[PDB]
Design a protein around this nucleic acid. Structure first.
Lengths: 209, 138, 73, 56, 37, 162, 123, 161, 36, 167, 176, 69
RNA sequence: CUCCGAACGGUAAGAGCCUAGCAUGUAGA
């Protein structure tokens, strides 16, 4: 998970491999994919959705940074008008684009440094790269490259936007960057290594045998 | 193999022009020939032969037939058409006709530097078998 | 204006001075004009992170001193 | 993943398996398939017949 | 950083007239383009 | 690591000519059976012979009583296995040593079918002897040691048949 | 559109045929242009005629290095193309030339434990 | 004469054309005594007489072609030549407006430049920067000023061959 | 300075010990014999 | 520049002690005496292309013998990789000592020979040729990879710099 | 095994039998999807079947150097090294287009310049469309004249570097 | 002659292709009078000839009008 | 006021499966 660095620096290397004990970024990718799946399953018919179609990604699809596969493949309802590719912070969106029937989401994690603060820039860059890259498994042409900076607790996204979902994904990322379980485990491991000590919900009628 | 000499050719070059260019065409054909079929050095056998015949012409024009002028027995050697040292080796009474070095004994070169037809015709080609390693001249 | 280092462990350590809001195409053009090569053969990686020739330079967040592994196509 | 019954080996990456049976010493042991160039007429029959099969 | 050698081994009728078998011994030219073999 | 003056040669390996011409090479070719630099000299045993050379080094051959290029013997002419396991050797040996060793080995271009050199093949134009008998299969190191000879058993059973 | 294809096949054949003859005559045109410039240099005008442009492929519009800004070499490998990427006036501070390098105490060439060189062009 | 052109016809093969047997000395003595970059760096073809001949000693396996020819240019003739060249260069720089001489790296990734120009070479523009001297003041240096060796067949002004 | 070399030597010894432990109880040495 | 040139001139003037030694040791004079050398007459551009091809084939066979199928010299004497090997291959390609300098020298030589081959093959062919050689020695100052193997080269490159402003 | 042609090949004088293409590009050609299939062996006949079923004419596409099947098939025929008669048969085929394109490209890479003009010149009449893959992946429909013009006059019309054909003037002055 | 004549009577173009003009002639009885090889030869000669007479008839009209002027 | 530098100190070590450019030329019967 400790994606990369520059120089040898054995101390920080041991520090980072200790900060990630188990397959931890795999856990974060699973957690955030399921968070997006639940946010989609909450309002499915309201967004002209067809079904949560979380695609079988490779087991190291979260650690590999050369390619970019589709984390989830939303099937829209019918004649789903896609807007132009833009950012998440901009409000003047352009709804004059094509109308696709498949909508891909690929969550990326970027353990950034001081010269990697801007997650929006890295996000749109990886978006344009994966889009133009004629080498990756990539079903739908319209989607989003929502990226998360774990080294500064940043969130960004740049891609083709849904009609009436931009604020939905905005609120979902605001509620996922906060109160996330694996994210909390990251924060706890970092506080411990850094030494700076400062089904539950029902409403579904489920049973267990 | 004519490229230039920074001057007009001598008086009677027009007569040697076609015969020289025939041998030059043969040389250009043997120089771009394929290696397939040449065992180790067979590809280098005919080229020396092409160097033989060429001189064997101009020498006959030089002072044998007495047909070439004083210019067309030195100018051809000044530019690359023949070999001066080779002709001088032919000027001797012993080495009348023989290739460069394929059969001679230990000369200044450890393999040979004297001749290729230098095998003695009495006992040359020991028993019956005649062959050479550079020119292949029996 | 940014100074980038197209470097390699094979006797090719070039330093190209390129613009801030420039592309990667013109950066490849500079790197090819400087060292020894044409424009369409160069490839600037950073640990298998292939830089494409349509994204911008400041958009990929490169800054003064960033060294990039040169590889020929 | 991929499975080779001749060598009874498990090929992981699709490309890893593609680069075994094409070059397998054991599979090559089932027959030497060094392809010699057919005659000049042999390459004409394949050109002619396909012109009458694909098109016609 | 010639030689004359009597073959005292077998001389009876090998090499008809196996008298003393003189030979010539030269050295072979070392080209100065050969690394340590 | 091993220079000398004259080779410890055979009487048949030298050749059926009273005057041959050797060519010494200081520190050539790396001895076959001990891997040591020694002094390679070749010669021509006779007309249309094989241009025989020197394989087994001076200490290699002097220690084990054997010639520098055939590994048979300087005293008898038998192999080094018969002359160890097996006297009988004196009636088993031969005088007038056949020069069927000093001849060129088989032209492989002829065995394939197209020997381009024609009559000028400096190799030999006979049929490649069939592979099946273990006298198609001997090597140097198994020969030079007593262990496992294809020849020495076949000549050692010539010693008790008749 | 077969009628249009044969019409353009001559459009390309004319240009390709025009490039051949235009390349042959260029060797004579270049020699002839030197002959025209020869008489032009001979008896056209004593400093009274140019008929020129002083054309250069890539104009190096340099500036002024501040105090010790590194001597950046553009690299002379590709200049016949006249690419616009070259015309950028490489006279700017790259990494550390942003400073004044005059308020410093005495001097600081390179603090990297390698100052083999010693020169500033004072003399 | 043409033994070299055919000896170069084997640049590396699978024991097909002098590959294995001639491999090690085509590497060893090739790398040990390079020494020909120097000679080529000491035998410029003299553009004022760019018809250079360059006699060369070559290895039979085709390892290196060494140029044993040392140049022996004559001092005052040399200096006068390069001065006349200086004048011509100033003239061509002053007359010509547009200057196409940015010809940088040739070939570019695996075009070997040897194809029909180290050969019969139908093109031979040996008239590069030769100043047209009028035979009214440059008479005595009229015929021996743009020959690369203007002494050879003299026997009066050249001490020897 | 030398502390880096000392730590590298300690890490190399630990890696050799781990490799020997994984090879002694290896599937091709231990579990392979356990199945025999 | 004039100051640097005068400095080189004077420092050469001091270190000029009368050379008289070595008993006239000559090279490429005994080589011609053996059977491993043959004299001929071949045009200069031909000899240059021959030397360039020979040097390239010598380096390529060094790389071949050394079991490195993932590197390529690229025929301009600029060593290029193939697949970006980084398991243990990059540790087996850290030459830096002589391969680097031989590469730089042969690159300079083949570059001069190519500049002269373009002449006979239809280059500008005017004073452009001499301008090419001038900027080629300039690039040998800068463009060539000479700096790494030896740094004292900069001294003469400084001369090649200062000498520029002499002309 | 993709080392030798079959057992022996007449080496083109340029670089080598298989190395007329750059080492990087050929090394990329091998490891590929299109190479994995059809690498079992293609001597003379199946090459024609694989050629008539690929309507692309291009070299490399994608940031990662991805060879087109056109380019990989050129390399496959280059390793096979067919006789000149088969190549003239491919150069004489007017029904199938890209087969003739490959034949011309191979005759350019391996063949005499005299033969190059003698066999490629009459391919300078067809005014038909030909599809090609650009370096960015996007395709483009061009004219056959553009292809043969870049092939005979220009250098590296595709990813491959061409082996330095003479200027036509020297041959017109010396030969036909 | 009948096939040559139908090519003109059915308005086959000299600036198009065989495959693209075929729908013009296939129903015509005279189409059955030749095999494929003969069809190709007559067609090729009709196309070559009609294109050449057309271009030449235009170049002539302009040249004649220039000359009269 | 134009003087411009490169390598090492660098990429943990690992058990199961798989593919390959290269090399001898001989002694002897």
């Amino acid at each position: 998970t400790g994606i990369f660095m520059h120089g040898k620096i054995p101390t920080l290397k041991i520090s980072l491999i200790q900060i990630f004990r188990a397959h931890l970024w795999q856990k974060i990718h699973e957690s955030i994919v399921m968070d997006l799946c639940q946010v989609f399953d909450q309002e499915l018919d309201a967004l002209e959705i067809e079904t949560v179609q979380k695609e079988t990604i490779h087991p190291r699809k979260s650690y590999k940074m050369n390619s970019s596969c589709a984390d989830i493949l939303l099937f829209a309802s019918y004649k789903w008008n896609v807007s132009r590719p833009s950012l998440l912070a901009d409000s003047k969106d352009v709804m004059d684009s094509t109308t696709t029937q498949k909508y891909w989401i690929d969550i990326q994690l970027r353990w950034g440094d001081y010269d990697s603060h801007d997650i929006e820039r890295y996000a749109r860059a990886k978006f344009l790269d994966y889009t133009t890259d004629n080498m990756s498994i990539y079903p739908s042409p319209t989607g989003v490259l929502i990226a998360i900076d774990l080294a500064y607790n940043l969130h960004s996204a740049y891609g083709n936007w849904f009609p009436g979902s931009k604020p939905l994904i905005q609120q979902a990322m605001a509620k996922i960057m906060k109160a996330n379980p694996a994210l909390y485990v990251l924060r706890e491991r970092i506080r411990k290594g850094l030494q700076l000590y400062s089904e539950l919900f029902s409403n579904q009628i489920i049973w267990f045998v | 193999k004519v490229k230039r000499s920074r001057k007009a050719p001598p008086d009677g070059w027009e007569l040697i022009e076609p015969t020289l260019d025939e041998l030059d065409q043969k040389m250009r054909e043997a120089e771009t020939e394929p290696h397939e079929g040449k065992r180790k050095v067979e590809s280098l056998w005919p080229i020396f032969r092409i160097h033989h015949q060429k001189t064997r012409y101009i020498f006959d024009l030089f002072y044998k037939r007495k047909a070439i002028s004083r210019e067309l027995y030195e100018y051809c050697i000044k530019e690359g058409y023949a070999d001066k040292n080779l002709i001088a080796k032919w000027k001797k009474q012993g080495y009348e006709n023989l290739c460069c070095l394929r059969c001679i004994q230990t000369r200044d070169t450890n393999f040979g530097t004297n001749c290729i037809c230098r095998v003695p015709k009495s006992k040359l080609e020991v028993g019956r078998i005649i062959e050479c390693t550079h020119c292949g001249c029996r | 204006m940014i100074e980038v280092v197209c470097n390699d462990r094979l006797g090719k350590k070039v330093r190209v001075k390129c613009n801030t809001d420039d592309t990667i195409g013109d950066l490849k053009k500079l790197i090819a004009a400087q060292t020894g090569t044409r424009w369409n053969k160069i490839v600037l990686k950073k640990w298998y992170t292939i830089f494409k020739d349509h994204v911008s330079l400041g958009d990929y967040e490169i800054h003064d001193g960033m060294n990039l592994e040169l590889y020929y196509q | 993943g991929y499975y080779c019954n001749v060598c009874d080996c498990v090929v992981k990456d699709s490309i890893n398996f593609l680069d075994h049976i094409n070059g397998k010493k054991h599979q090559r042991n089932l027959g030497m398939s060094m392809r010699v160039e057919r005659s000049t007429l042999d390459q004409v029959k394949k050109r002619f017949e396909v012109n009458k099969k694909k098109m016609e | 950083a010639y030689i004359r050698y009597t073959p005292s081994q077998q001389g009876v009728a090998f090499n008809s007239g196996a008298k003393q078998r003189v030979i010539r011994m030269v050295e072979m030219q070392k080209d100065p383009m050969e690394p340590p073999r | 690591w091993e220079d000398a003056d004259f080779p410890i040669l055979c009487q048949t390996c030298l050749g059926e000519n009273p005057y041959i011409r050797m060519t010494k090479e200081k520190y050539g070719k790396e001895c076959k059976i001990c891997a040591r630099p020694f002094t390679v000299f070749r010669w021509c045993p006779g007309v249309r012979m094989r241009f025989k050379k020197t394989e087994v080094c001076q200490t290699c051959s002097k220690l084990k009583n054997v010639c520098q290029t055939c590994l048979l013997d300087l005293e008898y002419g038998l192999p080094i296995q018969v002359r160890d396991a097996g006297d009988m050797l004196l009636k088993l040996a031969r005088t007038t040593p056949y020069y069927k060793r000093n001849r060129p080995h088989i032209c492989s271009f002829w065995v394939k079918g197209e020997c381009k050199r024609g009559e000028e093949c400096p190799y030999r134009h006979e049929k490649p002897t069939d592979p099946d008998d273990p006298l198609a299969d001997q090597n140097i190191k198994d020969r030079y040691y007593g262990i496992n000879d294809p020849v020495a058993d076949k000549l050692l059973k010539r010693a008790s048949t008749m | 559109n077969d009628e249009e294809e044969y019409e353009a096949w001559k459009v390309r054949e004319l240009k390709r045929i025009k490039r051949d003859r235009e390349d042959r005559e260029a060797l004579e045109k270049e020699k002839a242009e030197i002959e025209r410039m020869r008489n032009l240099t001979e008896e056209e005008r004593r400093a009274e005629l140019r008929a020129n442009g002083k054309v250069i492929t890539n104009k190096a519009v340099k500036g002024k290095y501040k105090f010790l800004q590194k001597y950046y070499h553009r690299g002379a490998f590709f200049m016949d193309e006249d690419e616009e990427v070259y015309k950028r006036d490489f006279s700017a501070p790259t990494l550390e030339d942003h400073f004044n390098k005059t308020i410093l105490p005495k001097v600081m060439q390179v603090k990297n434990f390698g100052r083999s060189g010693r020169t500033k062009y004072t003399h | 004469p043409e033994h070299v052109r055919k000896i170069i016809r084997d640049h590396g093969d699978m024991t097909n054309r002098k590959f294995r047997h001639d491999k090690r000395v085509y590497l060893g003595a090739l790398k040990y005594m390079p020494h020909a970059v120097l000679k080529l760096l000491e035998n410029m073809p003299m553009p004022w007489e760019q018809i250079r001949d360059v006699p060369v000693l070559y290895h039979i396996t085709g390892a290196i072609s060494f140029v044993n020819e040392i140049p022996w240019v004559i001092e005052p003739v040399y200096i006068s030549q390069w001065g006349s060249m200086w004048i011509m260069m100033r003239r061509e720089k002053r007359d010509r407006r547009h200057f196409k001489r940015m010809r940088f790296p040739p070939f570019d990734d695996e075009e070997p430049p040897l194809d029909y120009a180290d050969n019969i070479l139908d093109v031979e523009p040996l008239e590069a920067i030769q100043l047209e001297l009028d035979p009214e003041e440059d008479a005595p240096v009229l015929d021996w000023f743009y020959d690369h060796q203007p002494l050879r067949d003299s026997r009066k002004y050249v001490n020897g061959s | 300075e030398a502390r880096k070399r000392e730590l590298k030597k300690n890490k190399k010894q630990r890696m050799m010990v781990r490799a020997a432990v994984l090879k002694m109880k290896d599937p091709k040495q231990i579990i392979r014999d356990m199945e025999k | 520049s004039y100051q640097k040139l005068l400095k080189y001139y004077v420092l050469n003037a001091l270190k000029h002690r009368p050379p008289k030694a070595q008993k006239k040791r000559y090279l490429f004079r005994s080589f011609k005496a053996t059977k491993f050398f043959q004299s001929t007459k071949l045009d200069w551009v031909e000899v240059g292309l021959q030397v360039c091809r020979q040097g390239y084939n010598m380096l390529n066979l060094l790389i071949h013998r050394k079991n490195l199928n993932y590197l390529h010299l690229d025929y301009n004497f600029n060593l290029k990789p193939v697949k970006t090997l980084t398991t243990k291959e990059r540790k087996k390609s850290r030459f830096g000592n002589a391969f680097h300098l031989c590469r730089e020298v042969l690159r300079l030589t083949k570059l001069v020979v190519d500049s002269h081959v373009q002449y006979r093959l239809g280059n500008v062919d005017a004073f452009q040729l001499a301008d090419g050689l001038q900027y080629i020695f300039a690039h040998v100052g800068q463009l060539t990879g000479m700096y790494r193997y030896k740094y004292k080269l900069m001294r003469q490159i400084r001369m090649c710099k200062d000498l520029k402003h002499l002309i | 095994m993709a080392n030798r042609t079959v057992k022996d090949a007449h080496s083109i004088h340029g670089t080598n039998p298989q190395y007329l293409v750059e080492k990087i590009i050929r090394t990329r050609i091998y490891e590929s999807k299109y190479w994995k299939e059809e690498c079992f062996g293609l001597t003379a006949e199946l090459v024609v079947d694989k050629a008539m079923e690929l309507r692309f004419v291009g070299g490399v596409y994608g940031g990662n150097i991805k060879p087109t099947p056109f380019l990989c098939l050129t390399l496959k025929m280059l390793q096979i090294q067919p006789e000149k008669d088969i190549i003239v048969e491919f150069i004489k085929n007017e029904d199938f287009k890209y087969v003739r394109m490959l034949g011309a490209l191979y005759m350019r890479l391996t063949g005499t310049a005299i033969d190059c003009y003698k066999y490629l010149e009459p391919l300078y009449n067809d005014y038909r469309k030909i599809k090609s893959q650009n370096r960015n992946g996007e395709f483009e429909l061009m004219h056959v004249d553009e292809f043969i013009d870049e092939l005979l006059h220009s250098e590296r019309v595709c990813d491959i570097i061409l082996p330095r054909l003479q200027k036509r003037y020297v041959l017109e002055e010396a030969e036909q | 002659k009948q096939f040559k004549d139908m090519l003109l009577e059915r308005g086959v173009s000299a600036f198009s292709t065989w495959e693209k003009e075929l729908h013009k002639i296939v129903f015509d009885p005279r189409y059955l009078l030749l095999n494929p090889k003969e069809r190709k030869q007559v067609f090729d000669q009709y196309v070559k000839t009609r294109a050449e007479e057309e271009r030449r008839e235009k170049k002539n009209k302009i040249m004649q009008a220039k000359e009269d002027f």
